[PDB]
Design a protein around this ligand. Sequence first.
Ligand SMILES: [Zn+2]
Ligand SMILES: [Zn+2]
Length: 460
Amino acid sequence: IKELAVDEELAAADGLIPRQKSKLCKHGDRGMCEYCSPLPPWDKEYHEKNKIKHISFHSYLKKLNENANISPLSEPDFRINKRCHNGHEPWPRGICSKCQPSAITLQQQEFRMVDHVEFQKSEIINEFIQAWRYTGMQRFGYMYGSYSKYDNTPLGIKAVVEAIYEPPQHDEQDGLTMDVEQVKNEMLQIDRQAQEMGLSRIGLIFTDLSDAGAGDGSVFCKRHKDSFFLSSLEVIMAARHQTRHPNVSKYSEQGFFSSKFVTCVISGNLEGEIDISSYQVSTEAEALVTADMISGSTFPSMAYINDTTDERYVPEIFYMKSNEYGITVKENAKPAFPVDYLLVTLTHGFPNTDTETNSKFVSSTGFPWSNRQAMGQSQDYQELKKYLFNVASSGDFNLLHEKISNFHLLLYINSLQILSPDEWKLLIESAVKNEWEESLLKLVSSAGWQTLVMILQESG
Ligand SMILES: [Zn+2]
Ligand SMILES: [Zn+2]
């Protein structure tokens, strides 16, 4: 199929980085030579100098293309061919040079598919965190939004988060669980509706928050260099999500390469403050997990390597173990290795207030988010009436716009199946269009809307 607009745009950018004249330059200020010519966007020293921890995907792709001047990209695959009949019976009855997996060497991935996670409004994050503040129990959510150019790294991409949807879940003081099938079925419906709003499911976010007992609002720092950043189970979760949300690329043999799906953790920083850390996992991680080669066990920082079975062939596995200077040495990754090596890190932030606001939803709060009944925040007629009824008859379109421009409000209204599909589209336009007044005028006049407001009137 086609690539995202952001990938098409960045393919058409050259990412050149002009340089000052060098000492060694034997020419004028406007001349050029090997010492002062523009750097390519993937230039390692530039990234090191500027403390950019990974090069961007398009810097990486342009680097591969230059060095190969065959699809430059290919998703790694560590699975044994269980149907090789090249002069033997297939695994586990036989093996040959064509089907036998060779030794795997793991290392920190030098590029990242997404460079930055931008939350459109701090209220989005703060209302998610409120689930934990209110209950003392952890929380999981899916992030909706889109991808755009990020100019603070060469050819960078940012995930732009517009909303968070929390799936049904069983939260506890020190973790949480989900019914995988239940969540999948629900997210299928939410994905479809979010798509009608111009949103994609672009990542996941979860808390690891524990009050530090100082009456400060301060929290413990659990995740740091001497413990772990993401646990092996979390890395496996992230890999599975990435593989299920593949990034389309015409430059890969398979038509896809890795994923733009991002993983965020809200937890204490070293100063005891609530902060966000953002990650993806490497394509090596994707392939390890697809081949069912790693598991979580005793120590959360370590990825445990699984055994060879009838279904799974596990070759020798090495990793490029780093010292404090960043110098690596090849070591045996078995029986377990630090899962750190499977991560890439992303920056995160919020738009500045005077940046041109292109936020999809005017309000992030005010109407209960989904799956918060146990928090005392139900989505009912009583709640919708309280939220919306008086404004809906005031003639105040500014306030009405503010009320309906709200992701969780929209999903709840659509679930009532009062509005027609045309009226539903009208309501979406009223919520997310820059010029929304004409749409809202149509909606308010529609039979479906009138029906809804009347239903609100009679309830209570
Ligand atoms: Zn020069
Ligand atoms: Zn074979």
